[PDB]
Design an enzyme around this catalytic site. Sequence first.
Site, short mmCIF file in Angstrom:
data_model
loop_
_atom_site.label_atom_id
_atom_site.label_comp_id
_atom_site.label_asym_id
_atom_site.label_seq_id
_atom_site.Cartn_x
_atom_site.Cartn_y
_atom_site.Cartn_z
N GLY A 34 73.70 50.71 59.33
CA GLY A 34 73.89 51.62 58.21
C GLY A 34 74.09 50.97 56.85
O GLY A 34 74.70 51.57 55.98
N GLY A 75 71.53 49.71 54.48
CA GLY A 75 70.55 49.80 53.41
C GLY A 75 69.35 48.89 53.55
O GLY A 75 68.63 48.68 52.57
N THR A 77 66.55 49.22 54.42
CA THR A 77 65.39 49.79 53.78
C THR A 77 65.50 49.77 52.24
O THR A 77 64.58 49.28 51.57
CB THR A 77 65.17 51.18 54.36
OG1 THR A 77 66.46 51.80 54.57
CG2 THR A 77 64.41 51.04 55.71
N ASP A 99 0.48 66.86 64.61
CA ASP A 99 0.01 65.55 65.17
C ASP A 99 -0.98 64.82 64.24
O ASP A 99 -0.84 63.62 64.01
CB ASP A 99 -0.59 65.71 66.59
CG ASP A 99 0.48 65.86 67.69
OD1 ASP A 99 1.51 65.19 67.57
OD2 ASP A 99 0.29 66.61 68.67
N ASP A 150 -3.99 68.55 67.55
CA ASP A 150 -2.75 68.47 68.31
C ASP A 150 -3.08 67.78 69.63
O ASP A 150 -3.77 68.36 70.49
CB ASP A 150 -2.13 69.86 68.61
CG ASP A 150 -0.66 69.77 69.15
OD1 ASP A 150 -0.38 69.03 70.11
OD2 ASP A 150 0.22 70.46 68.61
N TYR A 151 -2.61 66.53 69.76
CA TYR A 151 -2.82 65.79 71.00
C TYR A 151 -1.77 66.36 71.96
O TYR A 151 -0.57 66.50 71.61
CB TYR A 151 -2.58 64.28 70.84
CG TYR A 151 -3.27 63.58 69.69
CD1 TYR A 151 -2.65 63.50 68.43
CD2 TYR A 151 -4.48 62.88 69.88
CE1 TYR A 151 -3.20 62.73 67.41
CE2 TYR A 151 -5.05 62.11 68.86
CZ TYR A 151 -4.39 62.04 67.62
OH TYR A 151 -4.86 61.23 66.61
#
Length: 1158
Positions: free
Chosen positions: A26, A28, A30, A1051, A1064-1065
């Site tokens: 307790g 401080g 931080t 195509d 169109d193939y």
Amino acid sequence: MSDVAETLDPLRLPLQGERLIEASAGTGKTFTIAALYLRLLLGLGGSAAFPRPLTVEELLVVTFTEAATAELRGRIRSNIHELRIACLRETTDNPLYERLLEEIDDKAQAAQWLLLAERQMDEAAVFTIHGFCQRMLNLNAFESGMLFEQQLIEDESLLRYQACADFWRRHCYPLPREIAQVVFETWKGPQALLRDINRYLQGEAPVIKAPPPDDETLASRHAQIVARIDTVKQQWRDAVGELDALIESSGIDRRKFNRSNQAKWIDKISAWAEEETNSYQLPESLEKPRHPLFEAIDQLLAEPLSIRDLVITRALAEIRETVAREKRRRGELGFDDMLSRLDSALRSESGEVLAAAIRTRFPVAMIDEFQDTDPQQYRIFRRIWHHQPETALLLIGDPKQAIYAFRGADIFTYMKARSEVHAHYTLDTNWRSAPGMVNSVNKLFSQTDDAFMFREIPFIPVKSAGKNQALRFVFKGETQPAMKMWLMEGESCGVGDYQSTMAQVCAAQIRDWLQAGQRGEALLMNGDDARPVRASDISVLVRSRQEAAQVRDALTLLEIPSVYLSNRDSVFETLEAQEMLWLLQAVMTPERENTLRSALATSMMGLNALDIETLNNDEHAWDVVVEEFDGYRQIWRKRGVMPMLRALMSARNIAENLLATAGGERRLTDILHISELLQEAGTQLESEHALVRWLSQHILEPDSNASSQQMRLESDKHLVQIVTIHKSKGLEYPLVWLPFITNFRVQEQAFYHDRHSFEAVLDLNAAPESVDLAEAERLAEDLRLLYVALTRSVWHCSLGVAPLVRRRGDKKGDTDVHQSALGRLLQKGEPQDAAGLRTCIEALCDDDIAWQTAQTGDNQPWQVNDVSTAELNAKTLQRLPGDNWRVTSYSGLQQRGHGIAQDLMPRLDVDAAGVASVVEEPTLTPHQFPRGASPGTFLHSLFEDLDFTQPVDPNWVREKLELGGFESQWEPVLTEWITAVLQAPLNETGVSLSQLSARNKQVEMEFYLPISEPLIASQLDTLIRQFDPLSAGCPPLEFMQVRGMLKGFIDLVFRHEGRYYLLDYKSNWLGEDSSAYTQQAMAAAMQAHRYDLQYQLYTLALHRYLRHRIADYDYEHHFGGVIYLFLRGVDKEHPQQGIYTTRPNAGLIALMDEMFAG
DNA sequence: TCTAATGCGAGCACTGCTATAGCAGTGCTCGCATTAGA
Ligand SMILES: [Ca+2]
């Protein structure tokens, strides 16, 4: 500095290399970090400042939790943002920032440096030890030997187990019965080996005091042992004489019992074991004229006779590298490896380039929670920062709170570091708590010297803050003391009793508080402000999952709801999972009468015995539930498990009912949680059944991730909270209970730290001197735990004390209470009478510290009521579905299966599909070319970039086939196939693809047609019919209303001097031979796949496109196209076979074009 | 429809002896704490 650290004044702390800051409970830690951070950014300070001002990407701050860095990072982006504003304003009327302002020399500048730092924060060098490690690793990958692409292995517990079995397999299976049996008697199997060594194997390997000679084989030791054993087995196969003369009392003639035993202990060995032959030795023979020549027994009972240290040593050496090799091969990295490889990197020769690299990125570094480091880390840290000018190393933490022994945290490597750095500092004031609390803790830990019994962990008292001088707790009358010892009666007292009784007492005192609080007589007060005590202010610290229960129970017995915040169970072994499993089975197959009945029976569904019965007799009602369930499977199959489950629940009105049913919230939120998991797992399986299976597995072998952990309910916030000493580090609470703070548990494993070298030593022979050293280290730890325990409270704390005894020594003035931390401070060290306790407690004891005797209690109530007014309703929307805008593409047609098909490969030969069989006929024809889309789109590929113009290289073709993974031997058939199809007459008049140069072709054009005014399948049918003789084969209008857009690929579109075409193939179907590619059959297939729709669409496209490109174009002076090459069915000399042509009505396109826009 | 932990000493009962009582050792019954902690 030197002896008894200086009271650290943040602002004047010299930010120049190596500082040890001790931040008590307790204090401080931080706030201090923060300040320091600001000081460094703005190069503030004085002669105590750092040489230059640093940047966000240069202040290294390491934390231990992922949550820590986050918080820390969040806290710092704030002090910056503020110190910065208070720099534009040049005024601050709030502590820290003012003193800092005073120190600043150009507020205007700070404010810009700060503003930059604020902007940078998304990269602050704030990392976890591990984060810091993979970073330094990855950057300098060449020194470290790292891969650039590593995979973070997560488990390693299974990796370890498997290595352990591999060990056993290759070291035991091959063993001959005599040795095998021996091993077996030491460990029944690999699971038991791991159980004995698993701890080691992890992190730094301890040193082995007295290892076996770097070579003894199992084979060898065995020999030596056996041989030591049999030579005594011979000098006993001669009990001819042993039938002796001269007496003694103890030694009876029921010795003839003792005799034979060993006489018969003459098997063909196989066991280093040997029941007791105490008497017939010779060492005691005298201790009880006396004995003869079997002084070879004095010798057998001297030497240990075991295979243990030998095998063990071998296992960890080997099990480690198995793990290692495996992790390399897979390409992975565990956490221990991360900072391990960073240690080996700073020690390799290539270790200076690296230390320097780092030192440059991070000139100064703040290590937080330092009390919890370990050899590997510390070494990383001094090697980089120790004795290195132009850098600073702030090590902040608290040795009194080092409780992570079991994880790997080494209090000794902290004590060493303490020896090596000379600047010590301490935070003197304890913000956060009441003065009496602060006083009684200081008092308690001040008794003896070296309270934490390791001179290096000295205990210095702390002052309480002024802002808190007014806190005090009153109960039913006057102020209660900050620390109260509750004390059981009697002389002895077992661990089992001191629990039942203590848990009892603790729950009692809790409702006594709790209800006196509803009445206003238990107040948490700060001077003249007061608030009643709620359940959210009580807290019970506990040492284990069991204790917690013991508490939850006695609490539950008074009706007082509780929560075990340190709960680790997974949602997968909750009984609710089992039900979900039955439910899913039910859904995935409601067909099977039985598996449905089981799901309906689960308590979750809330049915009745009367219910179940009647539904069994009403066969019409049942098939109704069966439909209901078929309905769920459908939702499941389409929208997901969650969506299905939500449907089910809304029906059987589950959530609503469950919540009404006591403890029903727990259950309900677990059920939802399972569904959230169930939903992810599903997006990684393409079967519902797989998921079900996925559930079973997780139900049979759980506790995996933190993700399958139980979520705590919002409200648990108003429940008394029961937590473990460990999860409580960091936490603050108004009132706390320590019901079982006197328990101990003697350390029996000889793993201790060397008192001089501070390294960890594993003694593989429980040599008493080491176990003794280990045991000391054990309360050396409980004191730290006690210190964390007393320290969480603000106003009050009461712990349970008992004349605890474990020694089975008949209450010999025992009460080995002096072997517990709390016991050791109370009885100043020396052991006491069961009454000597009572007198020590009384001894330190006025208002601040007080005691009462374990006053048990009963009164099942927690006499609290409720009231509730659910005045609710839900927003209903008044807008409506109406129309849907989409992008479609001749998919309005082609039914699904193509789900995600058109998505993964935009140009897959979607028109194909299937398998191919016994149509192999030993002479390759284009009809036997692999069927389906993968091959189909292989073909389209062929014609994407060709030189229709020149002839077909066959090499080119062998390459196409070779690259696309087809057998080369197709080249003959294919090249011969391509040309045929190139040299065919599409529209008789010239034509033939081969006459088309680049400039006259456009391959794969992509169009987008807006289509407004919904396109109704019906309305399109009418005109399609009128103008097309083909679409007269009327089954159409198979799609549904769509406004939107229309995507599409053509195509090929080529021109033949005035006249554009649509080609169109179509690689398509394996319909045996020729007979299937004639003008009808084609026209046939044409309708099967309603390709006719494609033409019309495609040409409406070409039409529009040409009209847009060719300024002043006319449909019938430029068009005349539409060719359809079914690639197969195309021969050099059988025209009109394989090819199909159409030329849309021109009157159709007209209507069609405006059928879009109106 | 399956099974269901060991292990350690105590604890009391009893059985040789030998300078009735203490020292010892044989043997079945039974209660007790075990794990921890992220
Ligand atoms: Ca095509």
